[PDB]
Structure formats: structure tokens, C-alpha cells
């Protein structure tokens, strides 16, 4: 078969598998775009002639936009670019929609529009804007006032007669009526479908939005029947856009022909006239990531490409197959062109060395249609994947999976992959009240480093749009890239399940630790899948953490850090990394009782330390392990990105996990502890690792010595609390005084260890503070405040994260005083930490003996046997370790 014959077939089926000649497709697209422009401009020129185009719908109006570009078009575009009315040629019919009821303004504010409206109505009735209507032409008016509408039409020089019947819902009235006028009061079965069917059968429709700047679902449905869409929330309220009387024929004809179309970009594609002289010296670099926002001309190019992506991604998001909807040829050609381009992409490309390949690929990467029955794999997957991903076996039968949702909103790995160019079918069942979508992959967009020299080596958009699903309705997908399937959810009940059915999917290595079940078999099966080595990507689900990882990166870590010992790697991931953090935070972990000391303290305080209501595990934290990251070689977020691999014992792993587990009421001076109060997680892990294993990791993180220097100097000032504050907490820098501020947090660990007379118990104070804080945050205030040491508070305290707030300082003071049964105000003052009068009154009410100011000093972070206690109440001792 010729490429010509392949293209013709693929326009019907969507099957681009054998289509490689992108130039041929681009030539067809060129003629299609030109056909659309010729049709539009001829119609708009006939409508406008030299009549005034003045049209002012006021603030109390909505915008009304084309939705299908092939058969709809703007009619009135204001100076600010807002579409105020649109024309429809959908299904071979004739429709016109305004964003306000212009018919009742033809004697007033829009008297000047009457001549033009007359031509538009001539075009509706006759199909020719210069053909006069017959006297007494029958007009049916539905959902807006009949008399006022007919009087409006008369005001424009027309002589309508009342059809006296409902042409929206009565097929016989539709057949004799010359025009149907609609507003938002209409009633009908299947309103969009009914409107479409009337239009297709030849009833001309004039729609007027009757709800001002308010949106209308009836209007949205009518407009969808015309192939139009309502503009966004607020309507014309802020912009107050209008067409001025100075608007020329030529200008509006040009704007209307160009709207939502890019003939210049099509021509650049066809001719290969990609820009050879972008000024790349204007790019800049931030932590190794190059961006180019200030390269002249580049942002405008990128925004034009975004229009195309936006257009196709609306179909993706709605789970609509473009090839199943009539009147979508332009978009079909764009998509088939991009699929053809994907057959020829080769990596890597550089922005200066390979301008034509780089720029054409830049466009093609933005145009991916996932909802289809067939289509092509991209031939080269570069730094993303390789031959394994391309050759993964797929299941011919339906697979059934049950997923648990740990919070109301987020996404979770389904445990299967789309294979490149291979159809899969998916559906969800048993979803309760959750709203669901399916997605592919988890990459963040900064992880395609296309502006770095020679690093355009994968697709721009490896993560698909979220593809909405309805319960019990199957959707067919084809990805050019393959990818890890994700269930995206919102409005869920924590702990609920969902059933996923999928046919045609591949099975990546997938480790699904069962919350409180034996896992030695799951581990063995995962290892066996890794040993078979048929995949480029894997996933791991363990508690509230999910890892999405390039296989080669995980192998690298197992080899480097574990000498090839996969078993120990996995067990440490689960226990030393994940379980360590969530246990430190005191969450209710299924089938894992609290330690005896935590149990006993909680019991002695009469606390709820075990309910799911207060202490359920939080929403999933995702981790991406890949060749590239969103920012730097590793980036905060959810997911957070790592490019080195995945080390269960690593500082960064736990530092980032810790950000997910931070709470404002345990931060000193809000944001000043933004990179402090999360460090308990990696510090605890390192203390544990030294004791159990003997590796001594990050042993100089906590800078007790320099904290001491700053405290000793600041407390010599006239206001000693302010003096310390200035030297320790004032600096707003992201990582300012990181080591010194950490030494505050560990004071309480050493203190608690001494209080309990047990070195192993020291970190329990943080677990207790977390348990206490979640009760403060969520328990019934009146019933629980006495038990939480907050009896003097009429209302729950605030949760501000601002550095100027005392909400964290206060809760730390109260929690620590309450748990230790000593008034801790002198040590809080020593550290420069101010508290509110309310919190001070509350500590006074406890009736506890003061703990005089103290300081725990050490010359190592991880080894606590050497820590020394300094009494600070009478003066400042010497630093007690030799320099």
C-alpha cells in the first residue's frame, strides 16, 4: 500500500501503524486548513459587507466560542479577543449563538447592530445573507419571551410571524418553522442531541444566552448541540469586551478565518523552514536546568504549540475518540501527522545543532491522541525506555485488580502498563462515590531537559492527560510511548476500594506490599519479574509510599549500595526507610502495635493514640526515580524526583519524605523550620543505622557547637530572647542556619532519654508530640482539650505556618511542657523562641516545677553516648569538647 492509501484509511480508523510520510500528511493538512479559511471568509464577508460591526453585550453576558473548528467559527470578536457570538455549520445546518439576549437591545444599546443582525437572520433562514426573508416567515421561540423576541426581530427590519408551536420538541413544527429562537428556559429530552438533530434536518437556530454573566447548563447543552461552548466563569464581567464601530470588514474577516487555526505553523512544517537563528545566549541555567523563556520569539512559538495540545487534550480528558466524531478532519490530520513524525524521531537532539529536527519534534510531542482503537508506537524512546518496553507481552484476556484508596484525593498505581502502540481497554467498577480517571506515567515536565545542550532525548509529555472514566464504561487507549497506568481519584472515602478491569495490558515488575500480611511471596515474585528483565520501568507500593522507577536506576542502587542483594534492599526500603518514618510520626500502621513505652505513656495520659479517625496513614507520597528530575538532580513535591537511584539509607530519601510529614504546629517560627522540622526523619534513621548496622552516615549534620556559639552571644544582649532570635532564627534563607536550628529539635531527644533513664527511648518524644498534635488538630475540642493540656483555651489554636505567628512555637511549648511535666519556658527563651501570652498562661496553669535552662552538647550527630548536659541557668559554660 502507498503512504497515500495508508493515510486515507488511517483518517477513518486512526490506525497510523504504517504511516511514515509526515510531509504527505502536512500537505493534506495545509489544504484542509485552507479549505476551512476559504469557507469562513466567504461566509463572514457576505455577512458583514460594509455594515457597522458595533456590538456591545455589556458586563452581563457570556462568551460563546467555537468548539469544533472545522464547522464552527466566530461571528463577533471583541477588541480584547473575546468571542461574543459564534456561527455554526455543524451537521450541514445553520446556527448562530449570542452571549446575551441581543434581540431585546435592538432599540437601545445595540440599535447599531440591527442591520447586521438582519443579514445574519437572512443567512439563517435562506442560507444567503443577502436573500430577503418572506413576509410572515414562521418563527418558533422556546425558552425566552416570545413577544419580546419577535419584536426584536421586527426592530431589525424583519417581518416574522409566531409559529405558535415548539420547534425544539415538535418534529412537525420543526418541519414548517423557518427559524427557532432558543434561550435558557427551554425544556427538552436529550437537549444537545435534540438540537443537533434539528440543525442536521435543516431547522436554522438562533440561540441567545439569557442569564447574563452567569453560566447556564441548559445553554451549555444547547451550545454543544451547535458545536459551540460557553466561555469560562464570570462571562464578560471583568473584560467588558465589545466590537467598536471602527471595526473594519477586512479585520473581522481575517480574525474569523484565522481563529483557532495556524496556517503559518502548517506552512513551516511543510517547507521545513524552522528557525535557524534563535538567540540561545538568552537561556539561563538554574541548578543545572536550562530554560529559555527570554529567548525572543520562543515563548510565542511555544504558546502556539500549546493551543494545539490544548485542543487535542480536551478530547483525551473527556475520553473521546477523535476518529469516532464527524467533522474533525483538521484535528485528525494534526494527530496523524504527529504519529508519522514519531516514526522518524531520533535522539538526542540539540537546540542549536539540530534546529529542524528539534523544532518539528517539539510540535509533534505536543500532539498525542490516546483514546483510540489503533495507532503507532514511537520508534525510539531514547532516555525514557528501550527495546524491552517496545516488546513487553500483553494480556489477551481481561485482568481484574482491586485497589485501595488511602485518602480522598490523589492517584495510585494500577500495577499494569500500556505497551507502545498496543490497544488496551480499561474500565472501573465498584467505585462508590469516587470520581475516577486513568493516567499514564508520572514524569514532571521539567524532566525532559530539551533546552540543555544535547539533552532533547525523550518526549516532552511522557505523562498523559487524566482521561475521565464513568463507572462501568470501557475506554480504549493506545499510547505511542507505553506507560505505567495510574488510577486518578477524588471525592473518595479513605480506605475504600475500586475494581479495575483491563485487557491488553503488560505487567511491569510490581511489588505490592500488603499492609500487615506476610510478603515473602510477593517479594519472591517481584524478584522473579526483575530477573526476567522484560521491562524498563517498575513500581513498588509499600504503605503510603509508591515508587515509580527506571529499572536500570534501581539495579544500579542495589549493585552499588547492596552488592547485588535485592532481598536486603527491599527489606530495608520497607523497614529502615518507610516504616521508620511513619512509625516515628505515630501513625496507625495496620497490624503493628505501638512500642511498650509509647503504649504506656499514651495510657497514662488517657489519650487516643490508635484510632484511624485521628491517626490514619496519610495520602500517598510518590517517588519518581529516573534519569532526569523536574529541577536539579532531585526535586521536592509529590512525586519527588531522584536521579541517583533509590537508597533506603539515604539522607535525601528521608529528608523529602519528611516534608510530606511536617505539620505547622511543630515548626519553630513557621517557615524558618521549613527545612528543619522534616529533618527528624533522616536524623532518626541515621541514629538507628549507626546502632543496628554500624554505618555512620551524615554524622556532622547537627551543629550543636555553632548553635551554642550563637546562643551564648545572643543571650548576652539586653533582651536575651531577641538577641538569640536575631542570631539563629531571623535569617529567612531557605537553608539558613540549617545545622544550628536542627540542634533545637534534638535537645528534646536527649532530654527525654534522660527523663526516661533509657537511651533507646529518646526519639519517642517526637512520636508523642505527633500523637498529641493530631489530637489538637482534629479531636472534638471541648471534650478533649483538658487531656491535651489546653483547658484554658476556649477554641482550638491556630495552625499558621507563617514565621510571624506563634502557633508552632506555642504548641511546641505546651506539648513539651505537658509531656515532660516541667515548665520549659526557660529553655524556649534560651533558644530565642517567643510564645503568646495565652500559651504562657496555659503553661503557668499546669503548676509544674520550672526546668531551668539547659543545653545538650555533642561533637557527633549520631552517637549519643558522648552527649554532655550543660546547666545554662546561671551563666554559659565553656563548650565541653576539645577543638
Catalytic residues, by residue number, are 656
Closer CB to Zn ion, 662 or 746, in the complex: 662
Sign of CA dihedral 435, 441, 446, 451: negative
- CB closer to Zn ion, 86 vs 677: 677
Identify the residue whose cell numbers are 502548517: 266
We find the least distance from the C-beta atom of residue 548 to Zn ion, in angstroms, to be 20
From the list 201, 235, 230, the residue with the least C-alpha distance to 218 is: 230
Phi and psi at residue 768, to the nearest 5°: -65, -40
Instruction: Provide the minimum distance between the beta carbon of 776 and Zn ion in the complex, in angstroms, as a whole number.
Output: 25
Q: Which three cell numbers stand for residue 235?
A: 462571562
Q: Are 119 and 130 in contact (CB under 8 A)?
A: yes
- Grid cell, residue 504, equals 491488553
Select 78 or 801, whichever has its Cβ closest to Zn ion: 801
The CB-of-801 to Zn ion minimum distance in angstroms stands at 15
Least distance in angstroms from the C-beta of 636 to Zn ion: 5
- Cα separation, 476 vs 480, in Å, equals 14
Q: Which residues does residue 180 pair with via DSSP β-bridges, in sequence order?
A: 140, 205
Binding mask 649-688 for Zn ion (x = CB under 5 A): --------------------------x-------------
Q: How far apart are CA 751 and CA 188, in angstroms?
A: 74
Q: Which residue shows C-alpha cell 451537521?
A: 91
Q: Lay out the site mask for Zn ion across 6-45 (x = CB under 5 A, - = otherwise).
A: ----------------------------------------
**CB under 8 Å, gap of 24 or more: what pairs does 353-356 form?**
353/454, 355/274, 355/275, 355/276, 355/278, 356/272, 356/274
Q: What is the rounded CA–CA span in Å between residue 384 and residue 388? A: 11
Residue 474 CA, chain-centre distance (Å), reads 24
Would you say 438 or 743 has its CB closer to Zn ion?
743
Which phi and psi angles does 512 have, rounded to 5°? -120, 95
Closer to Zn ion by Cβ: residue 675 or 807: 675
Report whether 846 contacts 823 (CB < 8 A): yes
Q: Supply the minimum distance, in Å, between the C-beta of residue 679 and Zn ion.
A: 9
In this chain, which residue has its C-beta nearest to Zn ion?
A: 675
Nearer to Zn ion, 372 or 444 (CB): 444
Q: Which residue stretches of 290-386 are H helix?
A: 298-317, 329-344, 355-365
CB of 541 to Zn ion, least distance (A): 24
Can you state the angle between helices 191-200 and 217-226, rounded to 10 degrees?
30
CB of 652 vs Zn ion, minimal distance in Å: 9
Q: Are the C-beta atoms of residues 181 and 139 closer than 8 Å to each other? A: yes
Looking at beta carbons only, is 457 or 653 nearer to Zn ion? 653
Select 412 or 678, whichever has its Cβ closest to Zn ion.
Answer: 678
Nearest distance from C-beta of residue 770 to Zn ion, angstroms: 19
**Cβ neighbour number for residue 388 with a 10 Å cutoff:** 16
CB of 358 within 8 A of CB of 351? yes
Closest contact distance (angstroms) between CB of 678 and Zn ion is 6
Between 641 and 675, name the residue whose CB sits nearer to Zn ion: 675
Q: Is 209 annotated as a binding residue?
A: no
Q: Contacts with Zn ion in 548-577 (CB under 5 A)?
A: none
Residues 6+ apart with CB under 8 A from 189: 169
Q: Phi, psi (5° rounding) for residue 483?
A: 170, 165
Which residues have a Cβ under 8 Å from the Cβ of 103 and sit 6 or more positions away? 144, 148, 149, 152, 153, 181, 208
Residue nearer to Zn ion on the CB measure, 316 or 678: 678
Dist CA 795 CA 272 (whole Å): 68
Percent of the chain as helix, strand, coil, to the nearest 5:
40, 15, 45
Identify whether the C-beta of residue 574 lies closer than 8 Å to the C-beta of residue 683: no
Q: Which residues contact 200 (CB under 8 A, 6 or more apart)?
A: 90, 91, 92, 93
Least separation in angstroms between CB 742 and Zn ion:
13
Q: Which residues contact 299 (CB under 8 A, 6 or more apart)?
A: 293
Place of cell 433562514: 125
**Residue number, 365 or 675, with CB nearest to Zn ion:** 675
Q: How far is the CB of 661 from Zn ion (least distance, A)?
A: 12
Q: Specify the residue, 133 or 662, whose C-beta has the smaller distance to Zn ion.
A: 662
Judge whether 655 is annotated as a binding position: yes
Number of residues that bind Zn ion (CB under 5 A): 1
CA 812 from centre of chain:
34
What DSSP string describes 185-232?
Answer: T---TTHHHHHHHHHHTT--EEEE--STTS--HHHHHHHHHHTEEE--
We find the least distance from the C-beta atom of residue 738 to Zn ion, in angstroms, to be 10
State the sign of the Cα–Cα–Cα–Cα dihedral 5, 7, 8, 9.
positive
C-alpha dihedral sign at 87, 88, 89, 92? negative
Q: How many angstroms separate the CA atoms of 478 and 675, rounded? A: 42
Closest CA to 685 of 677, 676, 697: 697
Q: Which residue has the cell 483557532?
A: 260
Q: Which spans of this chain sit near Zn ion (rule: CB under 5 A)? A: 675
Residue positions in the annotated binding site?
655, 659
Residue positions in the annotated binding site for Zn(2+)?
655, 659
Amino acid at each position: 500500500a502507498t503512504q497515500e492509501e495508508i493515510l486515507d484509511a488511517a483518517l477513518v480508523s486512526g490506525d497510523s501503524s504504517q504511516l511514515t510520510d509526515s510531509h504527505l500528511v502536512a500537505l493534506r493538512l495545509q489544504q484542509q486548513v485552507e479549505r476551512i479559511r476559504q469557507t469562513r471568509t466567504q461566509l463572514l464577508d457576505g455577512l458583514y459587507q460594509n455594515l457597522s460591526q458595533a456590538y456591545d453585550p455589556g458586563a452581563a453576558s457570556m462568551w460563546v466560542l467555537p468548539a469544533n473548528p472545522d464547522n464552527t467559527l466566530p461571528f463577533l470578536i471583541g477588541d480584547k479577543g473575546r468571542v461574543l457570538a459564534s456561527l455554526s455549520l455543524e451537521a450541514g445546518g445553520r446556527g448562530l449563538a449570542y452571549g446575551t439576549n441581543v434581540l431585546t437591545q435592538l432599540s437601545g444599546t445595540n440599535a447599531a447592530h440591527a442591520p447586521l443582525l438582519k443579514r445574519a437572520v437572512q443567512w439563517l433562514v435562506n442560507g444567503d445573507p443577502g436573500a430577503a426573508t418572506a413576509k410572515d416567515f414562521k418563527v418558533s421561540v422556546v425558552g425566552v419571551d416570545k413577544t419580546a423576541a419577535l419584536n426584536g426581530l421586527k426592530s431589525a427590519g424583519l417581518q416574522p410571524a409566531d409559529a405558535a408551536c415548539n420547534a425544539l420538541t415538535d418534529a412537525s413544527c420543526a418541519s414548517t418553522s423557518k427559524l427557532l429562537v432558543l434561550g435558557n428556559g427551554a425544556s427538552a429530552a436529550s437537549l444537545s442531541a435534540t438540537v443537533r438533530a434539528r440543525l442536521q434536518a435543516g431547522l436554522p437556530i438562533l440561540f441567545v444566552h439569557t442569564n447574563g454573566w452567569n453560566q447556564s447548563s441548559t445553554g451549555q447543552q444547547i451550545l454543544a448541540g451547535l458545536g459551540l461552548q460557553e466561555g469560562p466563569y464570570g462571562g464578560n464581567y471583568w473584560d467588558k469586551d465589545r466590537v467598536p464601530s471602527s471595526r473594519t470588514r477586512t479585520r473581522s474577516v481575517e480574525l474569523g478565518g484565522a481563529y483557532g487555526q495556524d496556517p503559518a505553523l502548517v506552512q513551516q512544517i511543510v517547507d521545513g523552514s524552522w528557525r535557524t537563528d534563535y538567540d540561545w545566549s538568552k537561556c539561563t541555567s538554574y541548578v543545572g536546568r536550562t530554560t529559555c523563556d527570554d529567548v525572543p520569539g520562543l515563548s510565542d512559538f511555544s504558546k502556539r504549540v500549546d493551543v494545539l495540545k490544548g485542543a487535542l487534550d480536551a478530547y483525551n480528558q473527556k475520553a473521546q475518540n477523535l476518529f469516532a466524531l464527524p467533522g474533525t478532519t483538521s484535528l485528525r490530520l494534526w494527530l496523524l501527522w504527529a504519529d508519522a513524525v514519531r516514526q522518524n524521531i531520533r535522539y538526542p537532539m540539540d537546540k542549536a545543532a539540530d534546529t529542524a529536527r528539534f523544532q518539528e519534534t517539539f510540535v509533534a510531542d505536543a500532539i498525542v491522541g490516546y483514546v483510540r482503537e489503533a495507532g503507532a508506537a514511537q520508534k525510539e524512546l531514547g532516555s525514557y525506555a528501550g527495546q524491552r518496553q517496545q516488546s513487553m507481552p500483553v494480556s489477551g484476556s481481561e485482568e481484574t485488580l482491586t485497589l485501595t484508596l488511602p485518602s480522598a484525593q490523589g492517584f495510585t498505581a494500577i500495577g499494569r502498563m500500556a505497551a507502545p502502540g498496543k490497544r488496551l481497554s480499561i474500565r472501573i467498577e465498584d467505585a462508590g462515590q469516587a470520581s475516577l480517571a486513568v493516567g499514564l506515567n508520572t514524569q514532571r515536565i521539567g524532566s525532559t531537559r530539551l533546552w540543555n545542550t544535547r539533552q532533547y532525548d525523550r518526549p516532552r509529555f511522557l505523562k498523559s492527560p487524566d482521561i475521565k472514566l464513568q463507572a462501568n464504561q470501557s475506554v480504549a487507549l493506545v499510547s505511542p510511548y507505553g506507560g505505567l497506568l495510574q488510577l486518578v481519584y477524588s471525592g473518595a472515602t479513605p480506605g475504600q476500594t475500586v475494581t479495575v478491569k483491563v485487557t491488553g495490558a503488560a505487567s511491569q515488575p510490581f511489588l505490592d506490599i500488603q499492609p500487615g500480611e506476610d510478603s515473602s511471596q510477593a517479594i519472591a515474585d517481584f524478584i522473579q519479574a526483575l530477573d526476567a528483565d522484560k521491562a524498563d520501568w517498575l513500581e513498588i507500593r509499600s504503605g503510603s509510599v509508591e515508587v515509580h522507577a527506571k529499572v536500570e536506576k534501581v539495579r544500579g542502587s542495589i549493585d552499588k549500595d547492596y552488592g547485588g542483594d535485592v532481598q536486603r534492599f527491599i527489606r530495608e526500603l520497607n523497614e529502615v526507610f518507610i516504616d521508620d518514618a511513619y512509625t516515628l510520626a505515630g501513625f496507625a500502621i495496620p497490624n503493628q502495635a505501638k512500642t511498650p513505652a509509647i503504649q504506656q505513656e499514651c495510657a497514662a495520659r488517657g489519650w487516643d493514640c490508635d484510632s484511624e479517625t485521628l491517626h490514619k496513614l496519610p495520602g500517598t507520597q510518590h517517588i519518581n526515580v529516573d534519569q532526569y528530575a523536574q529541577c536539579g538532580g532531585g526535586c521536592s513535591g509529590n512525586p519527588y524526583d531522584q536521579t541517583w537511584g533509590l537508597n533506603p539509607r539515604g539522607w535525601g530519601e528521608s529528608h523529602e519524605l519528611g516534608h510530606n510529614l511536617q505539620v505547622n504546629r511543630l515548626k519553630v517560627y513557621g517557615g524558618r523550620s521549613g527545612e528543619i522540622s522534616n529533618q527528624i526523619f533522616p536524623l532518626h534513621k541515621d541514629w538507628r543505622v549507626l546502632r543496628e548496622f554500624g554505618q555512620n552516615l551524615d554524622d556532622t549534620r547537627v551543629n550543636y557547637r555553632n548553635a551554642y556559639n550563637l546562643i551564648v552571644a545572643g543571650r548576652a544582649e539586653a533582651d536575651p530572647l531577641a538577641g538569640v532570635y536575631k542570631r539563629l532564627w531571623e535569617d529567612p534563607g531557605t537553608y539558613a542556619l540549617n545545622g544550628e536550628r536542627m540542634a533545637f529539635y534534638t535537645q528534646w531527644v536527649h532530654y527525654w532519654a534522660d527523663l526516661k533513664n533509657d537511651p533507646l527511648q529518646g526519639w519517642d518524644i517526637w512520636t508523642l508530640l505527633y500523637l498529641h498534635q493530631r489530637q489538637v488538630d482534629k479531636s472534638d475540642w471541648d471534650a478533649n482539650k483538658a487531656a491535651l493540656g489546653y483547658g484554658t483555651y476556649a477554641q482550638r489554636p491556630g495552625n499558621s505556618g507563617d514565621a510571624s505567628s506563634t502557633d508552632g512555637n506555642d504548641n511546641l511549648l505546651l506539648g513539651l511542657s505537658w509531656l515532660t511535666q516541667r515548665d520549659q519556658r526557660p529553655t524556649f527563651a534560651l533558644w530565642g523562641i517567643r510564645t503568646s501570652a495565652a500559651a504562657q498562661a496555659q503553661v503557668a496553669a499546669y503548676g509544674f516545677a520550672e526546668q531551668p535552662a539547659f543545653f545538650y552538647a555533642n561533637n557527633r550527630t549520631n552517637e549519643y553516648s558522648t552527649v554532655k548536659l550543660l546547666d545554662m541557668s546561671q551563666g554559659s559554660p565553656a563548650w565541653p569538647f576539645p577543638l
